[PDB]
Amino acid sequence: RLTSWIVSQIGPEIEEKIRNSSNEIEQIFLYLLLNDVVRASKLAIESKNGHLSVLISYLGSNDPRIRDLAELQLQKWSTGGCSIDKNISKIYKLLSGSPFEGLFSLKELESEFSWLCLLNLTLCYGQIDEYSLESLVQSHLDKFSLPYDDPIGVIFQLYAANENTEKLYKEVRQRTNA
Amino acid sequence: HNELIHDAVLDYYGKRLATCSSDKTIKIFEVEGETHKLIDTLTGHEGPVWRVDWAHPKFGTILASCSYDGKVLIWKEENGRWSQIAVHAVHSASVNSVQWAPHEYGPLLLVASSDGKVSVVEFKENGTTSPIIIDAHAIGVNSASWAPATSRKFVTGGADNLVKIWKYNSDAQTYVLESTLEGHSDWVRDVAWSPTVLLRSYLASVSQDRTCIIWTQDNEQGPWKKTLLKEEKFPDVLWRASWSLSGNVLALSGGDNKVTLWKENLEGKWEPAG
Amino acid sequence: DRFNVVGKLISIISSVIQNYDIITASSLAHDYNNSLVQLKKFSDLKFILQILQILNLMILNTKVPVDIVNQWFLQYQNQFVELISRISSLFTITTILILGLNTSIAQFLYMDTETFDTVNSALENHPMIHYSWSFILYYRRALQSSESFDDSDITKFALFAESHDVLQKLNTLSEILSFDPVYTTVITVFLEFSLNFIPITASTSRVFAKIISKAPEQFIENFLTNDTFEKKLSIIKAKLPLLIPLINLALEILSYLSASIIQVIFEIFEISLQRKDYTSIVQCCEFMTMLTPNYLHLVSSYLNKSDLLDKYGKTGLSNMILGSVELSTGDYTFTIQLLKLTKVFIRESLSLKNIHISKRSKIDIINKLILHAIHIFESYYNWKYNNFLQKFEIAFHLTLIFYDVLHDVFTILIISSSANKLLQLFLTPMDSIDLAPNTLTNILISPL
Amino acid sequence: LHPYNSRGLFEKKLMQDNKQLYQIWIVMVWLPKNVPTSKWLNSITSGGLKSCDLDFPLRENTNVLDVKDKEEDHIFFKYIYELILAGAIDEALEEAKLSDNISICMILCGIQEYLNPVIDTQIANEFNTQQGIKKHSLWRRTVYSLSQQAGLDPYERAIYSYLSGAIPNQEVLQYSDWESDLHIHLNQILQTEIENYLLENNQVGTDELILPLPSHALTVQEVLNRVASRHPSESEHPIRVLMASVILDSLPSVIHSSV
């Protein structure tokens, strides 16, 4: 239910950039943001990339061995030559199991997209509830500051601070009057 | 147009013929004798058309067609009407060779272009063209004939003037540079490998220097040997070269219309013959 | 004999470039072992390194003739190829390190002018166009500053190095090679000119911070015998190590500095707990090793509860309040500082050192850190370094602290009352390695 | 066992509640290089490279990177074809990783079905974390598109045939004899029929393929008549005929033809 919610509300911003001109891998990444996996693979298939399409059809799922290989491959790139694509780097950020908690942190999508576009990335490719929810959304507040001024923002924040709600509730009741 | 004709090559049956020109089309004129018969005029091109070739028949008869614009149009009759079933346009410059692989080998059209490139068109499983890009000559590759069995082999003709022999290996996946030839000093026109029915191939590597240098392999494991058709500069400049399927007889027409039936005799003399 | 490598360099640097699998023969067969046909191609790569050492001290060599020194414009077209990384990488470094320093240069290659004239004609083609080339030329106009004076060309190269390819992509990589450290001697001898006349690179902020940390002969060869330049050496050093190209290219005593220098920088790290400008942390807490041997006589006070390394009055190894604030360097190499500090602890409790606090203390400072079984062991660094040169020095200082007491007696003793505390962690599988090789079954894919 | 499972417990129950398929699986399964890794240097310098990955190889030519690891995609894959009929795929993972591949080796972690303390209950205890792919059937039909990919030369793909059940692509042959046919044969007999079995247990849908699934069940004895007519070079070995008959499980019939 929760990810349906996260996905629904990033509906317009992702559909806007679907319409617009985009990298091939920028479209695969954006399809994946509205949680579409097969479609993303089929566009991988069209770029003549079969081995890639295998990688898009792990997603919806992570497992521990592909993280170590994805990490090892981003690092091969660093001590390698010049020219990289950014979105290709993003596909490996999903594969590393670690959308923000890997060797690169995505701040290109909090200047183009929302902080809600970030919360989709932890709950779907930042491990799929081998952790509890509460701790995932709390580590994700610490990383990215979820407004004290959005009302849907403060919902997240007092699911994050489930543990000792009262203190953070008094403070944000002064900061959200909507 | 049909008056500054630059190719007219038949299939292996000899019953089908395709003639191109400066017409920007491929007027299909099949052989019924010195009468030929139109079946369709294929418009798709912009600019002068250089080479066409029908397929060797074991994978249809399928007409490639290379031209100024950048384009090789795969035409095929499918239910008594034509349809350009693929496009192979990976070039910008003048495309100068199309020659199918012989039906002793499988489906491997050979495209060459003066943009620098040879392209070994790999027919996929719907007939979907996919080349591997190779270079032979880095001024431009003006020609590309196949080497059949007198694994896979061909030859390309220089705008660097070299005539590079190209031989396939399957532990490196591409055409290994077999050897490199040069007795040429202006650009190569046509590199024609002989289809002899026995161990022997001569190569009339036609040149603009007003000379044609016949490299000779007496038997295939004999080396490439420099001989000349004649040992002088010709008055005019020399055009398309062919070798027969049985006899290994040279046939070329000159600028002044030099008829050539000069086959190598005992004495090693390119000797006038029937 | 060192002058006879003349041709051996240009060969070897060419053969690692584009030039790999190359056959004239065709139709090669398949399956046997399914041979060894593959294998030998990796031997080729190993070998290319072995040759090129001599170019990392080619400033101890004679003049390189005008011929091969000419060709940098049909040998400039692979960019000097900038783990098979490092193997490739050599050629940028070697051809740069052709010019070091010792005071040797004098022309008023590097003795000749026909070199620079012939080369220059074909140029304007980057900070490899300019690295080692405009440097010999900086001296070539510095001795012309009572003569006619030419700068026109030299500035133009200076400006051009500011375009496309960066200059930093070199000074980082030098470090990142380390097969034999003659590779990391290209720096700290060439860095004098890189600030001197080139418009001041802000990003040295990053790179040179790593270089001041320790340096005992290696990086400090480049002065204190030199007088060759009149700019950026020990001509401006005789005067407190704090210009401001003074600390971008250049390196009892305790109390003569500043009550001691030790007492100063106590609280200066207690500030930092969310802070940025990582540069500070990787040059100051890593310069804790130039006084940490043989002494803990005043350090001890702070170390009891440091915000370097503590777990008895701080959460984690007091660097998960300086490891969860960042993902960058200053967590990673901070945690390496933790490990180096720790072996320097045990290293002086194998035997007494003097004016210095007690041996019993030098184990109890570790016994604070004894807190890790819980999940402090798991926290220690984030994301996986899986490149096979490092993240292997992270539990190679933890593993030897039950070899230096249960099998390493060097004072007659060693174990006395220390066993009580020791055995809280070192006498219980973790410190005896039941989970050290099991963090390393995909981080080490190697000796398997 | 029962009540609600991933795809992991389905597969266990399958093998549990028949024993002629379980033996068929055991037949096909029963019967060193030093590589420093890294790429992407030499590629940008001559021409383009432009993005680092072995998917650059697949947008165009497979000459674009280093060509002494173009070597390795033939050669170390040949070692891998001896290995898979010596059993396992995690063996083949460890050699794929020396092959200078590190994102094409993710395909051999792909072969794992979902083993989880969120959806299995007797595989929740030898694992305390998520393993495999729970889109394992869309993985199977997408690693089966590579088995036919015609940009892929046979020395890569023949193991990608085999990862989705083995079409005989001639480099899953290295012994080429009666029993080498039969392994790859029997691999496809189980690999069609697990999807069928998973259509009962509903791990096959219409979002679970890019290619329509072969839901034809395949017969053992008839594919042995294929094998028998193919190799009258192993009809001369009666022992190779004894071998056949225990996987048929028709021991009186052979023993009555040999007296």
Coordinates of N, CA, C and O in Angstrom, one line a residue, chain A residues 14-68:
Chain A
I14 N 7.3 12.2 -13.0 CA 7.9 11.2 -13.8 C 7.3 11.2 -15.2 O 8.0 11.2 -16.2
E15 N 5.9 11.2 -15.4 CA 5.2 11.2 -16.7 C 5.5 12.4 -17.6 O 5.6 12.3 -18.8
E16 N 5.8 13.7 -16.9 CA 6.3 14.9 -17.5 C 7.6 14.6 -18.2 O 8.0 15.1 -19.3
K17 N 8.6 13.8 -17.6 CA 9.9 13.6 -18.2 C 10.0 12.4 -19.1 O 11.0 12.2 -19.7
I18 N 9.0 11.5 -19.0 CA 8.7 10.5 -20.0 C 8.4 11.1 -21.4 O 8.8 10.7 -22.4
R19 N 7.5 12.2 -21.5 CA 7.1 12.9 -22.6 C 8.3 13.6 -23.1 O 8.6 13.7 -24.3
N20 N 9.2 14.0 -22.3 CA 10.3 14.9 -22.7 C 11.4 14.0 -23.2 O 11.5 12.8 -22.9
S21 N 12.3 14.6 -23.9 CA 13.5 14.1 -24.5 C 14.4 13.6 -23.3 O 14.6 14.1 -22.2
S22 N 15.0 12.4 -23.4 CA 15.6 11.6 -22.3 C 16.6 10.7 -23.0 O 16.6 10.5 -24.2
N23 N 17.7 10.4 -22.1 CA 18.5 9.2 -22.4 C 17.6 7.9 -22.5 O 16.6 7.8 -22.0
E24 N 18.2 6.9 -23.2 CA 17.6 5.6 -23.3 C 17.5 5.0 -21.8 O 16.4 4.5 -21.4
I25 N 18.7 5.1 -21.1 CA 18.8 4.7 -19.8 C 18.1 5.6 -18.8 O 17.6 5.1 -17.8
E26 N 18.0 7.0 -19.1 CA 17.1 7.8 -18.4 C 15.7 7.4 -18.5 O 14.9 7.7 -17.6
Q27 N 15.2 6.8 -19.6 CA 13.8 6.3 -19.7 C 13.6 5.1 -18.9 O 12.5 4.9 -18.3
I28 N 14.5 4.1 -19.0 CA 14.5 2.8 -18.1 C 14.5 3.1 -16.7 O 13.6 2.5 -16.0
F29 N 15.3 4.1 -16.2 CA 15.3 4.5 -14.8 C 14.0 5.2 -14.4 O 13.5 5.0 -13.3
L30 N 13.4 6.0 -15.2 CA 12.1 6.6 -14.9 C 10.9 5.7 -15.0 O 9.9 5.9 -14.4
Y31 N 11.0 4.6 -15.8 CA 9.9 3.6 -15.8 C 9.9 2.9 -14.5 O 8.9 2.7 -13.9
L32 N 11.1 2.5 -14.0 CA 11.4 1.9 -12.8 C 11.0 2.6 -11.6 O 10.6 2.0 -10.6
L33 N 11.0 4.0 -11.7 CA 10.5 4.9 -10.6 C 8.9 4.8 -10.5 O 8.5 5.0 -9.4
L34 N 8.2 4.5 -11.6 CA 6.8 4.2 -11.5 C 6.6 2.7 -11.4 O 5.5 2.2 -11.5
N35 N 7.7 2.0 -11.0 CA 7.7 0.6 -10.8 C 7.2 -0.2 -12.0 O 6.3 -1.0 -11.8
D36 N 7.9 -0.1 -13.1 CA 7.6 -0.9 -14.2 C 8.9 -1.6 -14.7 O 10.0 -1.0 -14.7
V37 N 8.9 -3.0 -14.9 CA 10.2 -3.7 -14.8 C 10.4 -4.3 -16.2 O 11.4 -4.3 -16.8
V38 N 9.3 -5.0 -16.7 CA 9.2 -5.6 -18.0 C 9.4 -4.5 -19.1 O 10.1 -4.8 -20.1
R39 N 8.8 -3.3 -18.9 CA 8.8 -2.3 -19.9 C 10.2 -1.7 -20.1 O 10.6 -1.3 -21.3
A40 N 10.9 -1.7 -19.0 CA 12.2 -1.1 -18.8 C 13.1 -2.1 -19.5 O 13.9 -1.8 -20.3
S41 N 12.9 -3.5 -19.3 CA 13.7 -4.5 -20.0 C 13.5 -4.5 -21.4 O 14.3 -4.7 -22.2
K42 N 12.3 -4.2 -21.9 CA 12.0 -4.2 -23.3 C 12.6 -3.1 -24.1 O 13.0 -3.3 -25.3
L43 N 12.8 -2.0 -23.4 CA 13.6 -0.8 -23.9 C 15.0 -1.1 -23.9 O 15.8 -0.7 -24.7
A44 N 15.5 -1.9 -22.9 CA 16.9 -2.4 -22.9 C 17.2 -3.2 -24.1 O 18.4 -3.1 -24.6
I45 N 16.3 -4.1 -24.4 CA 16.3 -5.1 -25.5 C 16.4 -4.3 -26.8 O 17.1 -4.8 -27.7
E46 N 15.8 -3.2 -26.9 CA 15.8 -2.4 -28.1 C 17.0 -1.7 -28.4 O 17.4 -1.4 -29.6
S47 N 17.8 -1.3 -27.3 CA 19.1 -0.8 -27.5 C 20.2 -1.8 -27.9 O 21.3 -1.4 -28.0
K48 N 19.8 -3.1 -28.1 CA 20.6 -4.2 -28.7 C 21.3 -4.8 -27.4 O 22.2 -5.6 -27.7
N49 N 20.9 -4.3 -26.2 CA 21.6 -4.7 -25.0 C 20.7 -5.8 -24.4 O 19.7 -5.5 -23.8
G50 N 21.3 -7.0 -24.5 CA 20.7 -8.2 -23.9 C 21.2 -8.4 -22.5 O 20.4 -8.8 -21.6
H51 N 22.5 -8.2 -22.3 CA 23.1 -8.5 -21.0 C 22.5 -7.5 -20.0 O 22.2 -8.0 -18.9
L52 N 22.3 -6.2 -20.4 CA 21.6 -5.2 -19.6 C 20.2 -5.6 -19.3 O 19.8 -5.4 -18.2
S53 N 19.5 -6.2 -20.2 CA 18.1 -6.5 -19.9 C 18.0 -7.6 -18.9 O 17.0 -7.7 -18.3
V54 N 19.0 -8.4 -18.8 CA 19.1 -9.4 -17.7 C 19.1 -8.6 -16.4 O 18.5 -9.0 -15.4
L55 N 19.9 -7.5 -16.3 CA 20.1 -6.7 -15.1 C 18.8 -6.0 -14.7 O 18.6 -5.8 -13.4
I56 N 18.0 -5.5 -15.6 CA 16.7 -4.8 -15.4 C 15.7 -5.8 -14.8 O 14.8 -5.5 -14.0
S57 N 15.8 -7.1 -15.2 CA 15.0 -8.2 -14.7 C 15.6 -9.0 -13.7 O 15.2 -10.1 -13.3
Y58 N 16.6 -8.3 -12.8 CA 16.7 -8.7 -11.4 C 15.8 -7.8 -10.6 O 15.0 -8.3 -9.8
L59 N 15.7 -6.5 -11.0 CA 15.0 -5.5 -10.3 C 13.6 -5.7 -10.2 O 12.9 -6.3 -11.0
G60 N 13.1 -5.3 -9.0 CA 12.0 -5.8 -8.2 C 12.6 -6.7 -7.2 O 11.8 -7.1 -6.3
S61 N 13.9 -7.1 -7.4 CA 14.5 -8.0 -6.4 C 16.0 -7.6 -6.4 O 16.6 -7.2 -7.3
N62 N 16.5 -7.6 -5.1 CA 17.9 -7.6 -5.0 C 18.4 -8.9 -4.4 O 17.5 -9.7 -3.9
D63 N 19.7 -9.2 -4.5 CA 20.2 -10.3 -3.7 C 21.7 -10.0 -3.4 O 22.2 -9.0 -4.0
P64 N 22.4 -10.7 -2.5 CA 23.6 -10.1 -1.9 C 24.8 -10.1 -2.8 O 25.7 -9.2 -2.6
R65 N 24.9 -11.0 -3.8 CA 26.0 -11.2 -4.7 C 26.1 -10.2 -5.7 O 27.2 -10.1 -6.2
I66 N 25.0 -9.5 -6.1 CA 25.0 -8.6 -7.2 C 25.5 -7.3 -6.8 O 25.9 -6.5 -7.6
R67 N 25.3 -7.0 -5.4 CA 25.7 -5.7 -4.8 C 27.2 -5.6 -4.9 O 27.7 -4.5 -5.2
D68 N 27.9 -6.7 -4.7 CA 29.4 -6.8 -4.5 C 30.0 -6.7 -5.9 O 31.1 -6.1 -6.0

